[PDB]
Each structure stands twice: as structure tokens, then as C-alpha cells.
Motif scaffolding. Sequence first.
Motif, PDB file in Angstrom:
ATOM      1  N   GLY A 152      53.242  41.904  19.897  1.00 59.63           N
ATOM      2  CA  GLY A 152      52.905  40.764  20.715  1.00 59.63           C
ATOM      3  C   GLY A 152      51.546  40.222  20.325  1.00 59.63           C
ATOM      4  O   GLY A 152      50.827  40.785  19.493  1.00 59.63           O
ATOM      5  N   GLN A 153      51.174  39.097  20.935  1.00 65.30           N
ATOM      6  CA  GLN A 153      49.886  38.519  20.573  1.00 65.30           C
ATOM      7  C   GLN A 153      48.732  39.203  21.302  1.00 65.30           C
ATOM      8  O   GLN A 153      47.569  38.967  20.949  1.00 65.30           O
ATOM      9  CB  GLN A 153      49.892  37.003  20.828  1.00 65.30           C
ATOM     10  CG  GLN A 153      49.612  36.597  22.278  1.00 65.30           C
ATOM     11  CD  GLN A 153      50.853  36.680  23.180  1.00 65.30           C
ATOM     12  OE1 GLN A 153      51.867  37.287  22.824  1.00 65.30           O
ATOM     13  NE2 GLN A 153      50.767  36.072  24.352  1.00 65.30           N
ATOM     14  N   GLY A 154      49.028  40.076  22.263  1.00 71.56           N
ATOM     15  CA  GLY A 154      48.045  40.792  23.063  1.00 71.56           C
ATOM     16  C   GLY A 154      47.665  40.047  24.328  1.00 71.56           C
ATOM     17  O   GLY A 154      47.699  38.817  24.407  1.00 71.56           O
ATOM     18  N   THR A 155      47.311  40.816  25.349  1.00 69.25           N
ATOM     19  CA  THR A 155      46.866  40.280  26.633  1.00 69.25           C
ATOM     20  C   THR A 155      45.544  40.952  26.975  1.00 69.25           C
ATOM     21  O   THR A 155      45.511  42.174  27.170  1.00 69.25           O
ATOM     22  CB  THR A 155      47.883  40.558  27.756  1.00 69.25           C
ATOM     23  OG1 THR A 155      49.172  40.035  27.412  1.00 69.25           O
ATOM     24  CG2 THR A 155      47.417  39.938  29.052  1.00 69.25           C
ATOM     25  N   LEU A 156      44.463  40.171  27.047  1.00 69.13           N
ATOM     26  CA  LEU A 156      43.204  40.716  27.538  1.00 69.13           C
ATOM     27  C   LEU A 156      43.283  40.916  29.053  1.00 69.13           C
ATOM     28  O   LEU A 156      43.441  39.952  29.818  1.00 69.13           O
ATOM     29  CB  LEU A 156      42.038  39.798  27.188  1.00 69.13           C
ATOM     30  CG  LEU A 156      40.670  40.427  26.868  1.00 69.13           C
ATOM     31  CD1 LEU A 156      39.692  39.331  26.527  1.00 69.13           C
ATOM     32  CD2 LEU A 156      40.109  41.278  27.980  1.00 69.13           C
ATOM     33  N   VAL A 157      43.177  42.166  29.486  1.00 72.58           N
ATOM     34  CA  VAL A 157      42.969  42.503  30.885  1.00 72.58           C
ATOM     35  C   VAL A 157      41.516  42.935  31.042  1.00 72.58           C
ATOM     36  O   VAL A 157      41.050  43.860  30.353  1.00 72.58           O
ATOM     37  CB  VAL A 157      43.931  43.605  31.350  1.00 72.58           C
ATOM     38  CG1 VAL A 157      43.669  43.971  32.816  1.00 72.58           C
ATOM     39  CG2 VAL A 157      45.382  43.176  31.120  1.00 72.58           C
ATOM     40  N   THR A 158      40.809  42.270  31.951  1.00 72.89           N
ATOM     41  CA  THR A 158      39.409  42.550  32.247  1.00 72.89           C
ATOM     42  C   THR A 158      39.324  43.131  33.649  1.00 72.89           C
ATOM     43  O   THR A 158      39.763  42.489  34.605  1.00 72.89           O
ATOM     44  CB  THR A 158      38.574  41.268  32.152  1.00 72.89           C
ATOM     45  OG1 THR A 158      38.638  40.743  30.822  1.00 72.89           O
ATOM     46  CG2 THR A 158      37.122  41.512  32.528  1.00 72.89           C
ATOM     47  N   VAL A 159      38.743  44.318  33.786  1.00 74.61           N
ATOM     48  CA  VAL A 159      38.610  44.968  35.093  1.00 74.61           C
ATOM     49  C   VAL A 159      37.205  44.696  35.610  1.00 74.61           C
ATOM     50  O   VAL A 159      36.232  45.261  35.103  1.00 74.61           O
ATOM     51  CB  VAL A 159      38.896  46.474  35.020  1.00 74.61           C
ATOM     52  CG1 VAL A 159      38.840  47.091  36.412  1.00 74.61           C
ATOM     53  CG2 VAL A 159      40.263  46.711  34.385  1.00 74.61           C
ATOM     54  N   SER A 160      37.084  43.838  36.624  1.00 73.26           N
ATOM     55  CA  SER A 160      35.765  43.421  37.084  1.00 73.26           C
ATOM     56  C   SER A 160      35.827  42.974  38.533  1.00 73.26           C
ATOM     57  O   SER A 160      36.867  42.518  39.015  1.00 73.26           O
ATOM     58  CB  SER A 160      35.194  42.283  36.229  1.00 73.26           C
ATOM     59  OG  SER A 160      33.809  42.106  36.486  1.00 73.26           O
ATOM     60  N   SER A 161      34.681  43.090  39.210  1.00 67.70           N
ATOM     61  CA  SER A 161      34.531  42.542  40.553  1.00 67.70           C
ATOM     62  C   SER A 161      34.273  41.038  40.529  1.00 67.70           C
ATOM     63  O   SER A 161      34.573  40.352  41.508  1.00 67.70           O
ATOM     64  CB  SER A 161      33.402  43.265  41.284  1.00 67.70           C
ATOM     65  OG  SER A 161      33.483  44.665  41.058  1.00 67.70           O
ATOM     66  N   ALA A 162      33.748  40.514  39.417  1.00 68.13           N
ATOM     67  CA  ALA A 162      33.444  39.095  39.273  1.00 68.13           C
ATOM     68  C   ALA A 162      34.703  38.235  39.371  1.00 68.13           C
ATOM     69  O   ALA A 162      35.818  38.670  39.072  1.00 68.13           O
ATOM     70  CB  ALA A 162      32.764  38.832  37.929  1.00 68.13           C
ATOM     71  N   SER A 163      34.508  36.979  39.755  1.00 65.80           N
ATOM     72  CA  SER A 163      35.625  36.082  39.991  1.00 65.80           C
ATOM     73  C   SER A 163      35.780  35.070  38.862  1.00 65.80           C
ATOM     74  O   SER A 163      34.833  34.743  38.138  1.00 65.80           O
ATOM     75  CB  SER A 163      35.464  35.342  41.319  1.00 65.80           C
ATOM     76  OG  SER A 163      36.732  34.884  41.755  1.00 65.80           O
ATOM     77  N   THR A 164      37.002  34.557  38.750  1.00 67.02           N
ATOM     78  CA  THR A 164      37.359  33.624  37.694  1.00 67.02           C
ATOM     79  C   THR A 164      36.642  32.291  37.858  1.00 67.02           C
ATOM     80  O   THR A 164      36.758  31.640  38.900  1.00 67.02           O
ATOM     81  CB  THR A 164      38.860  33.385  37.708  1.00 67.02           C
ATOM     82  OG1 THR A 164      39.548  34.632  37.585  1.00 67.02           O
ATOM     83  CG2 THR A 164      39.252  32.480  36.579  1.00 67.02           C
ATOM     84  N   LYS A 165      35.921  31.873  36.819  1.00 70.59           N
ATOM     85  CA  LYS A 165      35.372  30.526  36.727  1.00 70.59           C
ATOM     86  C   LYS A 165      35.897  29.870  35.458  1.00 70.59           C
ATOM     87  O   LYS A 165      35.904  30.490  34.391  1.00 70.59           O
ATOM     88  CB  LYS A 165      33.831  30.527  36.729  1.00 70.59           C
ATOM     89  N   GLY A 166      36.349  28.626  35.575  1.00 72.69           N
ATOM     90  CA  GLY A 166      36.689  27.839  34.416  1.00 72.69           C
ATOM     91  C   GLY A 166      35.429  27.425  33.682  1.00 72.69           C
ATOM     92  O   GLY A 166      34.316  27.591  34.189  1.00 72.69           O
ATOM     93  N   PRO A 167      35.575  26.886  32.471  1.00 73.97           N
ATOM     94  CA  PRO A 167      34.405  26.507  31.670  1.00 73.97           C
ATOM     95  C   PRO A 167      34.033  25.036  31.751  1.00 73.97           C
ATOM     96  O   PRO A 167      34.873  24.162  31.966  1.00 73.97           O
ATOM     97  CB  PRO A 167      34.868  26.827  30.245  1.00 73.97           C
ATOM     98  CG  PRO A 167      36.329  26.498  30.289  1.00 73.97           C
ATOM     99  CD  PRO A 167      36.811  26.898  31.665  1.00 73.97           C
ATOM    100  N   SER A 168      32.749  24.770  31.512  1.00 79.74           N
ATOM    101  CA  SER A 168      32.284  23.425  31.179  1.00 79.74           C
ATOM    102  C   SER A 168      32.281  23.261  29.668  1.00 79.74           C
ATOM    103  O   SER A 168      31.807  24.140  28.949  1.00 79.74           O
ATOM    104  CB  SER A 168      30.880  23.165  31.722  1.00 79.74           C
ATOM    105  OG  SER A 168      30.706  23.772  32.984  1.00 79.74           O
TER     106      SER A 168
END
Lengths: 222, 208
Positions: A112-128
Motif C-alpha cells: 500500500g502507499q502507507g498511512t501516517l498515524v500520529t499519536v498526539s494530544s494536539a488537534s488537527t489544524k489545516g494549513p495556510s
Amino acid sequence: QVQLVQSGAEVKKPGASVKVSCKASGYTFTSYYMHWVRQAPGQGLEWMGIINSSGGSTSYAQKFQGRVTMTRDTSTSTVYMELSSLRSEDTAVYYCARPPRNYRAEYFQHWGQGTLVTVSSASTKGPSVFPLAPSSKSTSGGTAALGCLVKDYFPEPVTVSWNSGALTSGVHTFPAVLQSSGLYSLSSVVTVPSSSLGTQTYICNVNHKPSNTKVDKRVEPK
Amino acid sequence: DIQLTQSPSSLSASVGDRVTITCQASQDISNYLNWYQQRPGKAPKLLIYDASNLETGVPSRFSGSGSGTDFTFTISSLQPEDIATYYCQQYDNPPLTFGGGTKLEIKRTVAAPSVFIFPPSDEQLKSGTASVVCLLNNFYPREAKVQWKVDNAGNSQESVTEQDSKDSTYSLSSTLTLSKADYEKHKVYACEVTHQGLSSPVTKSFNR
């Protein structure tokens, strides 16, 4: 052709679970085993386990015993790997891989192409997405450099392309850096003929799947 | 578990060179040993299976040999697109284990960076932050120094690409971030680049 298309990247809080999917096509699903292999950033490859697409019986490496669950839907040709009670060091790209027909041959012919799973308390922000505009100070003997700066986003990754994939030569997309703010920033640049600046439009296509952000920014000269 | 020991950890060779990497298994694994190629950004790719068989579609310059505990992987004519990390993998006994990887870089001719500087965009300034970007493009070898001089002299960040499959060079992005006010304050923004290709540091600058 054989295709293993994996689910998108995501962030999960410590103690939560992820379920990563892997939709297979281009081959008879049930005739093949599926394996899962993970890779932490800048590290080696680690085998997680194996599932029989036919029947769904499973076997896992000892260290994931008790927290991994592999399943499969034979009607959608999809394989699932769920990792429960996540910890920091579960932050990894997870891969599905299929070996050949068995008629023991455990070498992975397709990934597969791979899936990054990130384990963090921080929340998702989109980019500028800001443009790095071609100037006389990004020109070098008829070669001009332009780009765009993808700033303040979480988690990784973003994908950048140029002109919807048409422009591939001269493109460098740099590894993201983790700012002091706990957010990532990245830049993508491309070198083009200075001749082209007036005649050709350059648009960078930024995509942040975790936050469902898709930006198309035209970069034009200063 | 069966440990796999790979050697060397990393190497640099020239296009056309013959390259051999070794794997050692902690116990006899007969010929159940595979070799994968992981190019930058890509998933691994099977090159050799069962110690010596060449996976279908893989160029003929790749070969492997061995049985028992000691295996080798050879690239007969190193190509620029062979930049990657190579891994062995056994399947004699679960759990399937990988070696630690061999990082293969290309040694090429010295190449000085093309330095470019980018002032912050108007959009970003509207938001109250200014990022100045210094680009060091297509250089070799990898060691490069960037010093920021704001008004001809702490919070910059750098990022280096993996070696480029095409021309075997590296690129570097440096970003100096400032509040809009601190940016509007100073006048000259320069990045001074030091690199083995340059007979002297190159400063690339702009006036706000």
C-alpha cells in the motif's frame, strides 16, 4: 494492475484506537494473504501480523498481541488493521502488503502507499498556503525559482503537486519542520525557465487529508 | 527472534560502481531471505526473493546470493535512481524480521548551491507574521551552512531533501520567522551560504 489503496492519515489521542483500511484490486482478493508492516519516522521496518483473506484467521507478532485486530471484508476486498490503546511510539506509517500465491512464501510483492498515524494530544489544524513568488532575487541566469510555503498545520502529512501533476521536473518538496508552536511548516519549490514566467501559470496544489484541506494557489511574479 | 545484521549502515558509491551489501542472520534461515528497496518517500519494493531470485520486472543489474546465515545483495552497475535504503527480511521463522537497513547515497562531483531568497508574501503579512525563505538548490555534498543576517547582523529552521534521484544533489530550505512588526522594522534581509563549492560565502539579500 494490482492496487492496494490505503486509508488516509490521521491523529489519535493516546489510549484511543485507529482502524486503517486497505482496499485491494486487480487480483482475486481471497487467494492471497495480507500482511501489515509499520515504520516509525526515520526508522526500520517492523512486521505486525498476517490475515488470511479467506476465512480471516490471523496471527500477530508478540509485541502487538492484545492490541491489534486484523479483519477483512471479502465483499469489498478490503483489509482492516486496528491498533488499540495507542502510545506515542505507535506514531508510524502503516503499510498493507501482499505476498504471492501460496498454492510458505512471505515476501511482499505489493505494498500500500502507507498511512501516517500520529499519536498526539494536539488537534488537527489545516494549513495556510502562501506563495513564494519568482523575483529577480529568485532568478539565476534564465532559471527562476518559485514555490509555496505551507505553514501552521497538524498532523503530518501534506502533499504538494504543481499544475495538478503536470509539472514534475525541478520540484523539491522539503521535509516538514516542527515549529515552536507545535505545528509543522513545509515549503515546496520549483525551478523553471525565466522565459516561462510571463507565458505560463504556475499553481501549487496543497492537500492536507487529515483536515480535509485542498488549496490551489497560483504563484505569480512580483 | 531471528535478528538480521546488515552492513554497511550507509555507503556512498559512484554511478557505474559495483555495490555489495551483506545480511547476517542470527541462526540458520536456509534461503528464506528477501531484499527490498525503499526510495525516498516511497513504500519498500521487492527486488530479491529467496536469497537469489530476481523479482519480475526488476532490472537485471540487481542480484543476490547466499544460504544459511550469510547473504549478499549486489548492484552490478550503480544507477542514480538506485538511491535508497535497502533492507533484508527473513521468513524462516515468525515473527518476520528485517535488518536495520543500508542507506545508499551517490557520490558525485562537487556542486555549489544556487542560492535564492524570498521575502514574505503580502497574504502572510496581512496575518501578522512574516516568513523569509532562503533556498539552497542542487548542491553536493550535503554539508552546507546558512547564516541569517538581518541588517548586517536565533529562530530559523532548516530542512534538507533526500538526494535527488536525477542529478544526485541535495536541496535546503531555511525559514526565518518574525512578527509583522519586527519584519517591518529592519531593512536588509540576507542569508549567507557557505559550501565547499564556493570559493567564498555567497550572500543573497533583499531590501524591504
